[PDB]
């Protein structure tokens, strides 16, 4: 919930008390918040391979995925802000379940850094598959809510009336380098912590797998991600009308 819902106040706040309370000043500040978010995605996706730790990797992952919300907020569009709210909810589910699985993986393995903690997929296969599916959801992979979020924000950029093509090209380019760098750190985490074989861990450990409670946690946070990836209007439809009530304050 520090990443699930506590990180979203501040993103939601930039919508309430900044976007519809101070609109003519947001029209001055959002051009720079855009550059900040575009640099934020790359910065927080390049720091994450720098982290040997497992949990700090996902913390920086959250710093990276908040960049799309910053961008959708600074996108003076209906698609941009709808993608920001959708990414609030999507990354809520994703980061919540990812930190949950990293904590349970630390409790099972009692190792933190990715230099140690080699192949643990045969030890904890349920945790392996849930972590892989939620890394795919963090990856903006279609069939998950992260894709439609990190695509509707792009679409709000390219359909923006505030910005011009000389800037839209640079912004989209620096945004979509983020989705090259995000595979790098997420699948680096996966191949470091799960893919491999450690000869000293053969049978004498025989760690316990994901119990039914933890499996229900991960699955229960997964099913809205899948359901929103296959039908996004579980999240757009509750906000989009209100988003127009925001943007009606911006165009005139």
């Amino acid at each position: 919930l520090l990443a699930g819902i506590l990180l979203k106040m501040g993103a939601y706040g930039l919508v309430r008390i900044n976007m519809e309370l101070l609109p003519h000043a947001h029209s001055m500040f959002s051009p720079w918040l855009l550059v900040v978010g575009t640099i934020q995605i790359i910065y927080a996706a390049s720091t994450s391979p720098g982290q040997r730790n497992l949990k700090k990797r996902i913390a920086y992952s959250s710093v990276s995925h908040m960049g799309f919300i910053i961008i959708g907020i600074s996108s003076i569009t209906d698609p941009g802000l709808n993608g920001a709210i959708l990414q609030i909810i999507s990354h809520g589910f994703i980061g919540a379940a990812l930190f949950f699985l990293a904590g349970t993986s630390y409790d099972r393995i009692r190792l933190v850094y990715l230099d140690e903690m080699g192949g643990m997929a045969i030890s904890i296969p349920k945790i392996f598959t849930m972590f892989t599916i939620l890394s795919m959801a963090s990856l903006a992979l279609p069939g998950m809510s992260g894709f439609i979020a990190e695509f509707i924000v792009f679409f709000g950029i390219i359909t923006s009336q505030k910005y011009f093509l000389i800037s839209k090209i640079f912004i989209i380019f620096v945004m979509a380098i983020g989705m090259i760098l995000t595979p790098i750190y997420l699948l680096s985490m996966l191949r470091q912590m799960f893919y491999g074989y450690k000869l000293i861990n053969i049978k004498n450990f025989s760690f316990f797998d994901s119990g039914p409670r933890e499996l229900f946690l991960s699955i229960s946070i997964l099913l809205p991600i899948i359901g929103i990836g296959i039908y996004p209007d579980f999240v757009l439809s509750l906000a989009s009308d209100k988003v127009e009530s925001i943007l009606s304050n911006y165009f005139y």
């Binding site: 391979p49 040997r52 009692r110 990715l114 230099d115 140690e116 903690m117 080699g118 192949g119 680096s188 191949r191 470091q192 893919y195 491999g196 074989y197 450690k198 000869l199 119990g211 039914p212």
Partner: protein, 150 residues
């Protein structure tokens, strides 16, 4: 884990990025990765119902009634639509189910994995919170090793 002695520092911090797996020189293919294991002949029967109910029975703390209501709850909400449309009845019944489940989950067994880590010394079966209402046993101070063997 335990590490009663201090562990040995590894003189080879293998790398910031590459995984901690063994090299392909020492990798016995087939047997490790399971690409040539699973010779059918050591497998067992239990075709999909003798191993589902076995797994449900493997992980369950549900008694006859608590558990029956668990099996009949989600079918009740699934028939809350496509058979009728009650409305607030569904939520009132779901709250009733949650509260009666929580009252039932004040289980007569206490299962000492529920208790604090400091309790695990030995002989904890003689401790019986299961029957003794108003236990009155000042052992949760956790600053001195009292002899609670009486």
């Amino acid at each position: 884990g335990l590490s009663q002695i201090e562990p040995d520092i590894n003189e080879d911090p293998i790398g910031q990025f590459e995984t901690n797996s063994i090299e392909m020189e020492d990798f016995k293919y087939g047997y490790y990765d399971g690409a040539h294991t699973y010779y059918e002949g050591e497998v067992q029967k239990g075709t999909f119902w003798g191993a589902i109910a076995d797994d449900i029975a493997a992980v369950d703390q549900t008694n006859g009634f608590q558990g029956l209501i668990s099996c009949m709850f989600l079918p009740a909400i699934a028939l809350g639509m496509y058979f009728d449309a009650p409305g607030e009845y569904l939520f009132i019944g779901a709250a009733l189910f949650t509260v009666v489940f929580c009252i039932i989950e004040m289980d007569k067994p206490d299962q000492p994995h529920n208790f604090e880590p400091q309790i695990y010394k030995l002989e904890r079966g003689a401790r019986d919170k299961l029957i003794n209402d108003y236990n009155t046993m000042s052992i949760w101070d956790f600053n001195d090793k009292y002899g609670d063997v009486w």
